[PDB]
Amino acid sequence: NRLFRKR
Amino acid sequence: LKLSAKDIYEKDFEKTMARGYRREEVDAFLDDIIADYQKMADMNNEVVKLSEENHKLKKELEELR
Amino acid sequence: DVSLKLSAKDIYEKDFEKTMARGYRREEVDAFLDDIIADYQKMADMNNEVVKLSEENHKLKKELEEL
């Protein structure tokens, strides 16, 4: 899941 | 298929201040596509299971007239 | 669920809000979605079949239920 992949 | 669910997760694009697309809008949409690719991978087997069930249910029917 | 939520058409039509902060280059996103479109086109027929078998089996279970 790439929406949650930073910060 | 040219891509896998994994390739889409892994993919990174170049950032820009010059009217680039909203990152969270892009990543949310690609997460829906990731799910769809997972389903694409299982689909042939799901078609096979469904046609076997299709056949079983049709035999039962004809036997019950 | 086993059928796709999106189609080739949905991905072609999808229009992303622009930002003047740190955003993705439109060229790269657009080019990547093109490859994705090609894969949705290759699976569209098998996906139509999955929907149809699901709908048919549901109706057949309903028909058996009544007997």
Numbering used by the authors:
A (entry chain C): 424 to 430
B (entry chain A): 6 to 70
C (entry chain B): 3 to 69
Task: Cite, word for word, the article reporting this structure.
In the Firmicutes phylum, GpsB is a membrane associated protein that coordinates peptidoglycan synthesis with cell growth and division. GpsB is a DivIVA-like protein that is highly conserved in Firmicutes. The full-length Sa GpsB is a relatively small protein of 114 residues. Its N-terminal domain homodimerizes as a coiled-coil, while its smaller C-terminal domain homotrimerizes, forming a hexamer as the biological unit. Dimerization of the N-terminal domain is facilitated by a pattern of nonpolar residues every three to four residues, promoting the formation of a hydrophobic core in the coiled-coil. This N-terminal domain is partitioned into three regions: a relatively short α-helix with approximately two turns (residues 10–16), a second longer α-helix (residues 28–70) that forms a coiled-coil, and an amphipathic 10-residue loop (residues 17–27) that links these two helices and intertwines with the adjacent protomer, ‘capping’ GpsB.
Remarkably, PBP4, the only class C PBP encoded in the S. aureus genome, which purportedly functions as both a carboxypeptidase and transpeptidase PBP, has a short, cytosolic C-terminal mini-domain with the sequence of N-R-L-F-R-K-R-K, satisfying the consensus GpsB-binding motif (S/T/N)-R-X-X-R-(R/K) found in S. aureus FtsZ and in orthologous PBPs found to bind to GpsB. To do so, we generated an R24A mutant because of its central role in the head-to-head interaction and its distance from the PBP-binding groove. This point mutation successfully disrupted the occluded crystal packing interface and allowed us to determine a 2.40 Å resolution structure of Sa PBP4 peptide bound to Sa GpsB. Unambiguous electron density for the Sa PBP4 C-terminal octapeptide, which adopted an α-helix, was resolved at the PBP-binding groove of GpsB. This structure clearly shows that two of these residues, Arg425 and Arg428, are key components of the Sa PBP4-Sa GpsB interaction, where they form multiple hydrogen bonds with the main chain amides of Sa GpsB Ile13, Tyr14, Lys16, and the sidechain hydroxyl of Tyr26. Furthermore, Arg425 and Arg428 form two salt bridges with the carboxyl sidechain of Asp32. Additionally, Sa GpsB Asp36 appears to play a major role in stabilizing the PBP4 α-helix by forming two hydrogen bonds with the backbone nitrogen of Arg425 and Leu426, an arrangement that is only possible when these two residues are part of an α-helix. Overall, the complex of Sa PBP4/Sa GpsB is very similar to Bs PBP1/Bs GpsB and is distinguished by the interactions of two Arg residues with the backbone and acidic sidechains lining the PBP-binding groove. A crystal structure of the Sa PBP4 C-terminal recognition sequence bound to the N-terminal domain of GpsB reveals a binding mode that mimics previously solved orthologous PBP/GpsB pairs. This discovery is notable because it was previously thought that only the N-terminal ‘mini-domain’ of transpeptidase PBPs (class A, class B) could bind to GpsB.
